[PDB]
Write a protein that binds this ligand. Structure first.
Ligand SMILES: [Mg+2]
Ligand SMILES: [Mg+2]
Ligand SMILES: [Mg+2]
Ligand SMILES: [Mg+2]
Ligand SMILES: [Mg+2]
Ligand SMILES: [Mg+2]
Ligand SMILES: [Mg+2]
Ligand SMILES: [Mg+2]
Ligand SMILES: [Mg+2]
Ligand SMILES: [Mg+2]
Ligand SMILES: [Mg+2]
Ligand SMILES: [Mg+2]
Ligand SMILES: [Mg+2]
Ligand SMILES: [Mg+2]
Ligand SMILES: [Mg+2]
Ligand SMILES: [Mg+2]
Ligand SMILES: [Mg+2]
Ligand SMILES: [Mg+2]
Ligand SMILES: [Mg+2]
Ligand SMILES: [Mg+2]
Ligand SMILES: [Mg+2]
Ligand SMILES: [Mg+2]
Ligand SMILES: [Mg+2]
Ligand SMILES: [Mg+2]
Ligand SMILES: [Mg+2]
Ligand SMILES: [Mg+2]
Ligand SMILES: [Mg+2]
Ligand SMILES: [Mg+2]
Ligand SMILES: [Mg+2]
Ligand SMILES: [Mg+2]
Ligand SMILES: [Mg+2]
Ligand SMILES: [Mg+2]
Ligand SMILES: [Mg+2]
Ligand SMILES: [Mg+2]
Ligand SMILES: [Mg+2]
Ligand SMILES: [Mg+2]
Ligand SMILES: [Mg+2]
Ligand SMILES: [Mg+2]
Lengths: 98, 138
RNA sequence: AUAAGCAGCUCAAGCAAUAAGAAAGCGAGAGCGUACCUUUUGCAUAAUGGGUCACCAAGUUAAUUUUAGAUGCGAGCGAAU
RNA sequence: AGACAACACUGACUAGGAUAGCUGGUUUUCUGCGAAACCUAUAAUAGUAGGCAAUUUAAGUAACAUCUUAGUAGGUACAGA
RNA sequence: AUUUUAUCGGUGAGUAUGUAGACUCGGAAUGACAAAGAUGAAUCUUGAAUAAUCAGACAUAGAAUGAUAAGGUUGUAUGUCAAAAGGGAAACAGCCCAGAACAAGAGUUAAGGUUCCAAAAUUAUUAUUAAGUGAAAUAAAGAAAGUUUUUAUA
RNA sequence: CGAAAAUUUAACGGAUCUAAAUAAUAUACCGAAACCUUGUCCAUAUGUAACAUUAGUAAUAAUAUUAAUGUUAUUUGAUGGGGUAGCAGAACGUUGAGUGAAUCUUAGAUUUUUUUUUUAUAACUAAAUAUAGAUGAUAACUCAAGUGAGAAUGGU
RNA sequence: CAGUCGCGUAAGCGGGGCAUAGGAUCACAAGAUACAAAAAGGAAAGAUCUUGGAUUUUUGGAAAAGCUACGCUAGGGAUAACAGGCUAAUUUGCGCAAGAGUGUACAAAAUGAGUGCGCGGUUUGGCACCUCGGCUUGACUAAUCCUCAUGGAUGCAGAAACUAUGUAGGGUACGACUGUUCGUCGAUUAAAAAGUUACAUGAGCUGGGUUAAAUACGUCGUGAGACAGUAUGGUU
């Protein structure tokens, strides 16, 4: 193509820091909701599903925090900043093996 | 308890379904805060916009008047002396010095009723040609 | 008269009133800004049109058929005697 | 030689009588709301009509959106032989 | 006439290996339908009145097509542009933020950044690189007493 | 190292950097017309008070009230604010007309300028120049349109 | 629901077929209905219901063949030819890796099957963002024909040449044929190499090719005419 979308293949240490904090912030929203309901003895299927198949920022590997799965790439990995609205959508899990 | 929910990010380029979740919460602009009880029907509403809002558990709900007073700054001044003025509906309010505290408002259809000096008050002052300051004062 | 401005905007030194009072204007220097219209998915576009200024220059009228609002009369209305 | 018939000739000049689903143009301000480039039909495919539907403001709402809880339809990713 | 095979094809058996648009015994998430409740910015329906539009473009994911080429052509899902200014991407219709009624503020923030151009760190910690590699658009297979680490080993 | 293309270093934006590179972390700060605060403008509601106008209803010889309209303030410390095609509402201006046999004008009407002020497509203040008593100008309300032009290889 | 028929002991089933592939109006024709009947009685021509005949197959439904290079108007660049842009299948453009094999011997002096990984933007193409050659005069690239330095070469005795590494300062001429770039050939030369630049350069020149009106030939067409044909001529 001749139209230039200058998007670097890797992120800067500043974009990574904000990513860690956005993943950390989401964990606090879920924990705040889960703790508020536990005090009343209630549960929500969405929360129970999140805490079951989604890790916390402290439990994620750097590769899972800054990259995503892409079957079209050489090594099946791709910069997470290449996902649409990547700063406002949740993305923490990739297929096993990649 | 209650959920103190505040919109931190926008949903401009997000799907239409996300706009409805925010509309059902009452979040219309950034940094707008709402209060909802701690219930499943509201928790699930937050798990859909958890990437956009900030949540907090609070004991009680704050009123629209009490939620806006926590950002109100101190005025930084106090009117201690008000000069004579005319209020269209009430009347003429005489000078008041709140430092020594008396806002007396006089209304009428004649000048003497307003509490001001008239042409007659100036003529009696001019005819008092005998009053003289005390020699000690001079 | 050391400079690469769609000539405007933001910041602004200085000059400017023979005199008490009164600073319009021009502006060094710094920064932001690629005309307008048309037509297009999309135009600074090297796509269309214009040398400048002034004037002339484009949803109107009639008949007919409807609607809204207002208003006259009212199971009658109008017209005409 | 489609050559010539007085600027014009694969049919002159002049007066009277046209259309153009195409191109261009359509002039003051403020305020409110706010699309589509899809479907169907067409001698259609630069057009048009009916829908979806933008707008005006009345009459309704057990309206519409979202989440929660329970329920239902249907076989993609995946996995398997 | 005759028998024999660690040769070919065929049949039977295998809870053997692979293969998948027209295989799906198993089977998500998502999306769809309806009920109740709650919430919300009237966003819905109807009546009356009454338009524009009918080559769209790009990004992301996943396909058909092409040559697993095209800023190619053509569906699906989502968004932006179109009709959206502003900050970031050096410059930028379509990307990352964010929706401009007008001012003031060393105000609070998003994406993005903080040596100078140029507002903000020459801010702290642990390692690697010596090639200006790199530092906002990753050229490949491959070679090699470059260097570091780890794991075995003399 | 592999790694070669034709104007010029030539896709770090440049200077330059041994980190101001790379990887894994932490904090502060900057940062938009976003947000907040204080004010302003506009649009659309809710009640209340007051001012003015118009039209009614009562009182008055020893003023009050009702309704509509305009307006300011105030209550809920009300809500809302990009925009093409397109739809809608509210206004200004131009020309002529009615009220007009009206109003004003040498004590200066009118003067294509300049200037001043006012939320202001407009009017107003003042200044300079000239000099008209109506074939002059004009508020307000209303009526009717040959009514508003940087765009037509437009016309003069 | 009404009407009235069939089958069934009965309950009950039946308004064609297991399901999914057959077009209207108009006109015309055959039956019914008793509606209206242009003075009146009738009728004609109409109306309502049932029914029939359709590659109405451009199947929401016209009775319909061509040429224009003598051409014209309105438009589009919403769809082409040249150039630019994207792409790189292909190429008369290259490199690297591996090494069957050739080299009397011996893989790598030379040579290199079928392949793999790439570069580059010269050829023929795709897309549709966007509607020639010569002369004169240059600039630039380096993947080098000559000249300069140099490694390898059972296959470097010398000479000459082969291959390869540096290197683009300068040079790369003359003629015949062809409209030619290209190509073929003659004769010299140290050598008579390439490419990019709008396949550089026509507001610098040329106009032979392509090339509108004229004309002929062949072929095609019933014909007007046409042709990736040929020929002579044709305002730069
Ligand atoms: Mg480009
Ligand atoms: Mg100077
Ligand atoms: Mg130019
Ligand atoms: Mg132009
Ligand atoms: Mg011109
Ligand atoms: Mg005019
Ligand atoms: Mg006009
Ligand atoms: Mg002829
Ligand atoms: Mg002729
Ligand atoms: Mg709006
Ligand atoms: Mg659309
Ligand atoms: Mg037809
Ligand atoms: Mg058309
Ligand atoms: Mg199954
Ligand atoms: Mg495309
Ligand atoms: Mg939008
Ligand atoms: Mg458009
Ligand atoms: Mg923008
Ligand atoms: Mg930068
Ligand atoms: Mg600060
Ligand atoms: Mg600084
Ligand atoms: Mg570098
Ligand atoms: Mg550079
Ligand atoms: Mg704002
Ligand atoms: Mg806004
Ligand atoms: Mg608006
Ligand atoms: Mg004057
Ligand atoms: Mg003009
Ligand atoms: Mg009769
Ligand atoms: Mg049809
Ligand atoms: Mg049909
Ligand atoms: Mg001919
Ligand atoms: Mg095009
Ligand atoms: Mg040697
Ligand atoms: Mg030299
Ligand atoms: Mg050329
Ligand atoms: Mg030229
Ligand atoms: Mg001749």
């Amino acid at each position: 193509g001749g139209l230039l979308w200058k998007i670097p293949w890797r992120m800067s240490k500043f974009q990574k820091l904000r990513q860690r904090r956005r993943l950390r912030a989401v964990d606090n929203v879920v924990a705040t909701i889960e703790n508020a309901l536990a005090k009343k003895g209630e549960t929500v299927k969405a929360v129970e599903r999140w805490r079951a198949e989604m890790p916390t920022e402290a439990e994620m590997l750097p590769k899972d925090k800054y990259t995503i799965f892409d079957r079209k790439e050489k090594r099946y990995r791709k910069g997470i900043h290449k996902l649409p609205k990547w700063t406002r959508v949740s993305q923490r899990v990739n297929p096993p093996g990649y | 308890s209650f959920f103190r929910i505040t919109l931190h990010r926008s949903a401009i380029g997000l799907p239409k379904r996300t706009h409805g979740v925010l509309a059902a919460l009452g979040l219309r602009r950034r940094n707008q805060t709402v209060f909802h009880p701690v219930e499943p029907q509201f928790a699930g509403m937050l798990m859909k916009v958890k990437e956009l809002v900030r949540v907090e558990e609070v004991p009680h709900r704050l009123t629209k008047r009490e939620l806006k007073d926590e950002r109100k700054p101190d005025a930084g001044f106090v009117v201690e002396k008000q000069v004579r003025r005319f209020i269209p509906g009430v009347g003429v309010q005489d000078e008041v010095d709140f430092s020594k505290v008396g806002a007396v408002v006089r209304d009428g259809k004649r000048a003497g009723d307003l509490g001001v000096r008239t042409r007659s008050d100036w003529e009696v002052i001019g005819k008092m040609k005998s009053v003289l300051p005390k020699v000690k004062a001079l």
